[PDB]
Ligand binder design. Structure first.
Ligand SMILES: Cc1cc2nc3c(=O)[nH]c(=O)nc-3n(C[C@H](O)[C@H](O)[C@H](O)COP(=O)(O)OP(=O)(O)OC[C@H]3O[C@@H](n4cnc5c(N)ncnc54)[C@H](O)[C@@H]3O)c2cc1C
Ligand SMILES: CN1CCC(Oc2ccc(OCc3ccc(NC(=O)c4cc5sccc5n4C)cc3)cc2)CC1
Ligand SMILES: CN1CCC(Oc2ccc(OCc3ccc(NC(=O)c4cc5sccc5n4C)cc3)cc2)CC1
Lengths: 133, 666
């Protein structure tokens, strides 16, 4: 019903080898050349990657900034209000970014800021100007 | 198998069903009720049991009816019909047995049997047992035919038949009880020795023998599941299918490598686009950190725009540093996934040159068993007689296989050195023309009612013919002769003065260097206590070694033994014997094989007797005059001694029913 476990005798493969006299050698050569083509395509990409790996030498360690977590405050100081308006102008509706720019304001407070001071800070104009960029 | 049921299996008969032959002899029973059939079947099985429990004395009808019990011994004409049927067709009272009722006072009918082989001797024994005048014509100076034993002193070595292929259902199990046969088993451990003299490790000996048996099952899948049996109008041979399967396995090995290395380029190219994204992100981080620094150089106090600039660059730099860490996380998983794929590569090759040579030895052993190169065996029908293989360990004859045909020839009228040259069969009788092999200018004429021809299949193939048939054999007969294959097989007997090998090792093999010479002295035998090595020549090398002198063949034999056992531990043999069965004019080969383009149906064509035409136009249909027995005429047991033995019993019963009458069918 099935070949012995280890033999691969499909009806499709038998006819491709029994076509002509040298159809056996023709099939086995096109696989030997395809093996050579892929093998040296490896060492081409294997060298391209090894060359790019040295450009990343040292990582980004001389560029990381130290970690500073501050108390998530509640009172919106006059300073922190202006930082939010500029954050909306630059980041739009990315509240996680605006929260990190201010630092001491939670994401829910930033969203509540979008509605409370929506009147006096003209957040609708600030947002539609961000949509230009 | 035990009881009366086992005696039926021993006689190659089913114990619970009437056979095709029994239906023709008892058509009133097989068409009647089931009760009559089972009564008949017990009488048949019980009679066979009595014969097999003591085959050295004749089993008479009076003895069979005495040892039966009711209700089986109530119908006497049924017991008489069963006993006369079994006696006629050689199922009981065959071989060598003391006769209770001495032979009839005078004989009835004249039968000439051509050939004193096992098939001819068996039929002559039964035909003379039935009360006919039998005369055998043998061209050789001895009986046995292809059962030839070499004896010089205590030395014994069979040049022809040698192995009894089990006793479960073998008629030779009956002969081995009537004749003093010394049967010995065969240790099936064969260490292989490469051409360099060193042995094959048990590592490769199994991982190649297993791959060999798996290649044969693959060819059966090609034949019976894919119908790969015709390749450009020509029938596919077993050698073709084996090469096709091997090439498909070498093809799958390459397909596994290509798809494995293709997994690497696919992953290594993911790493290329990832490193390019990391090197561009590191350049943005390098630029952003510079801009963040310049914004921090602005000494406080500063307006909210310059303060927002520092807070903005800090958040943007922290976000870019968060992307680079996730990309380095992905780089770690891809970099070790590549070490995963490059650490588990598929097989480099299917079989190496060292493996392929050892595989060729197993192919040579297959070419020995079939006595022909695998490029000639029919892929579909080469193993047609496999279902009828006997059960039990295969044995050999320790005192020589020739003791059986010699013992069968006891009491027969055999004309030795009488080569038949022309067989004439007409509607009114037959005449056989033969000459004396020692001086062909001396002619003999034999008249008879029927001729039984047991000429070897190679002799029937001769062109120009060695035996002329008048009238010529019909096309369906001659075409069946040309379709069937007759193989070739040779042995080399090496008689030394002492043993220099392993007495426990019955036999060891030699792995040739080339595929073209895989059968050239590939196996060495040591069977008896006497120092006789028996080298085997098979395959394509069998026909080529016949064109080489004896001293050169022995030279290649010693060259193999010197490299295996030591250059000084191998003495010169005192007696050498090399067989040449293809060059033998009375055999013209070894035995038959199912050639490509042939089938098992040709074996039955070889058995059909020839009936001549009417002598006078308008005369009734004549009687079959020319019969054929022999190794090549039995479909289910060809190429064997027991097959020829059975074929002789077949025609002997057929000729007897023709000229003596079958009274057991009423
Ligand atoms: C090398 C070898 C090894 C074998 N090993 C085994 C084995 O191990 N086990 C097994 O079961 N079988 C084996 N066989 C096969 C077995 O020997 C045969 O199947 C069997 O012996 C055939 O018997 P036969 O009577 O049909 O033919 P034969 O034994 O050949 O009898 C035919 C006779 O006719 C005679 N004859 C030929 N031409 C003429 C003529 N023109 N005029 C008059 N007479 C003629 C011949 O001399 C011969 O005696 C082996 C065969 C060979 C060659
Ligand atoms: C380890 N491995 C190594 C190979 C082993 O295979 C073998 C092991 C032992 C082995 O003994 C050697 C051997 C035993 C018997 C036969 N048969 C015949 O000569 C024969 C029987 C019949 S019937 C009609 C023809 C015929 N012929 C020709 C030939 C070789 C032959 C092979 C199996 C184990
Ligand atoms: C099927 N069979 C395969 C081999 C297995 O193990 C062995 C069994 C027997 C073993 O004795 C040795 C042995 C060797 C060769 C054969 N060959 C034949 O009889 C034969 C079949 C056919 S078809 C046309 C011709 C022909 N012949 C001649 C017989 C027995 C040695 C090993 C057991 C199952």
């Amino acid at each position: 019903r099935k070949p012995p476990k280890g033999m691969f005798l499909s009806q499709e493969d038998v006819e491709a080898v029994s076509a002509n006299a040298t159809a056996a050698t023709t099939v086995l050569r096109q696989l030997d050349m395809e093996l050579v083509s892929v093998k040296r395509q490896i060492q081409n990409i294997k060298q391209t990657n090894s060359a790019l790996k040295e450009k990343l030498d040292g990582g980004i360690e001389p560029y990381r900034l130290p970690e500073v977590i501050q108390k998530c405050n509640a009172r919106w100081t006059t300073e922190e209000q202006l930082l939010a308006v500029q954050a909306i102008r630059k980041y739009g509706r990315d509240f996680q970014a605006i929260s990190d720019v201010i630092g001491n304001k939670s994401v829910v407070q930033v969203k509540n800021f979008f509605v409370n001071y929506r009147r006096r800070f003209n957040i609708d104009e600030v947002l539609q100007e961000w949509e230009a960029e | 198998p035990s009881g009366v049921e086992g005696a039926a299996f021993q006689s190659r008969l089913p114990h619970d069903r009437m056979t095709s032959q029994e239906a023709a002899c008892f058509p009133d029973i097989i068409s009647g009720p089931q009760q009559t059939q089972k009564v008949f079947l017990f009488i048949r099985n019980r009679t066979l049991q009595l014969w097999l429990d003591n085959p050295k004395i004749q089993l008479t009808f009076e003895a069979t009816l005495q040892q039966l019990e009711a209700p089986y011994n109530s119908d006497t004409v049924l017991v008489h019909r069963v006993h006369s049927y079994l006696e006629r067709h050689g199922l009981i009272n065959f071989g060598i047995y003391k006769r209770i009722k001495p032979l009839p006072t005078k004989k009835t009918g004249k039968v000439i049997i051509i050939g004193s082989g096992v098939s001819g001797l068996a039929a002559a024994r039964q035909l003379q047992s039935f009360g006919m005048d039998v005369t055998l014509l043998e061209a050789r100076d001895r009986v046995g035919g292809r059962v030839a034993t070499f004896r010089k002193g205590n030395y014994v070595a069979d040049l022809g038949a040698m192995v009894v292929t089990g006793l479960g259902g073998n008629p030779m199990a009956v002969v081995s009880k009537q004749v003093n046969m010394e049967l010995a088993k065969i240790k099936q451990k064969c260490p292989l020795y490469e051409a360099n003299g060193q042995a094959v490790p048990k590592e490769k000996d199994e991982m190649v023998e297993q791959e060999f048996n798996r290649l044969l099952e693959a060819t059966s899948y090609l034949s019976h599941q894919l119908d790969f049996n015709v390749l450009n109008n020509k029938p596919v041979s077993l050698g073709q299918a084996l090469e096709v399967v091997i090439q498909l396995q070498e093809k799958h090995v390459k397909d596994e490598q290509i798809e494995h290395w293709k997994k690497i380029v696919k992953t290594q190219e993911e790493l290329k686009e990832l490193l390019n994204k990391m090197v561009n992100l590191k350049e943005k981080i390098k630029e952003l950190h510079q801009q963040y620094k310049e914004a921090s150089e602005v000494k406080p106090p500063r307006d909210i725009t310059a303060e927002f600039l520092v807070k903005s660059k800090h958040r943007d730099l922290t976000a870019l540093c968060k992307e680079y860490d996730e990309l380095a996380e992905t780089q770690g998983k891809l970099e070790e996934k590549l070490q995963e794929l490059e650490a588990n590569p598929p097989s480099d090759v299917y079989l190496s040159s060292r493996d392929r040579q050892i595989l060729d030895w197993h192919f040579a052993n297959l070419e020995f068993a079939n006595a022909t190169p695998l490029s000639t065996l029919s892929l579909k029908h080469w193993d047609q007689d496999d279902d009828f293989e006997f059960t039990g360990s295969h044995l050999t004859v320790r005192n020589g296989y020739s003791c059986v045909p010699v013992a069968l020839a006891e009491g027969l009228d055999i004309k030795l050195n009488t080569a038949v040259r022309q067989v004439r069969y007409t509607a009114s009788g037959c005449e056989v023309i033969a000459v004396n092999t020692r001086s062909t200018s001396q002619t003999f004429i034999y008249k008879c009612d029927a001729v039984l021809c047991t000429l070897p299949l190679g002799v029937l193939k001769q062109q120009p013919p060695a035996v002329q048939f008048v009238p010529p054999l019909p096309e369906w007969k001659t075409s069946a002769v040309q379709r069937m294959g007759f193989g070739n097989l040779n042995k080399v007997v090496l008689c030394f003065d002492r043993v220099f090998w392993d007495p426990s090792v019955n036999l060891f093999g030699h792995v040739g260097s080339t595929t073209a010479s895989r059968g050239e002295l590939f196996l060495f035998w040591n069977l008896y206590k006497a120092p006789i090595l028996l080298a085997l020549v098979a395959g394509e090398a069998a026909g080529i070694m016949e064109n080489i002198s004896d001293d050169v063949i022995v030279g290649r034999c010693l060259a193999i033994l010197k490299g295996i056992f030591g250059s000084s531990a191998v003495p010169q043999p005192k007696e050498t014997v090399v067989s040449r069965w293809r060059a033998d004019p009375w055999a013209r080969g070894s035995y038959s094989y199912v050639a490509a383009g042939s089938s098992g149906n040709d074996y039955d064509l070889m058995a059909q007797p020839i009936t001549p035409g009417p002598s006078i136009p308008g005369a009734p249909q004549p009687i079959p005059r020319l019969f054929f027995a022999g190794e090549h005429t039995i479909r289910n047991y060809p190429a064997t001694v027991h097959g020829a033995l059975l074929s002789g019993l077949r025609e002997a019963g057929r000729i007897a029913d023709q000229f003596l009458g079958a009274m057991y069918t009423l």
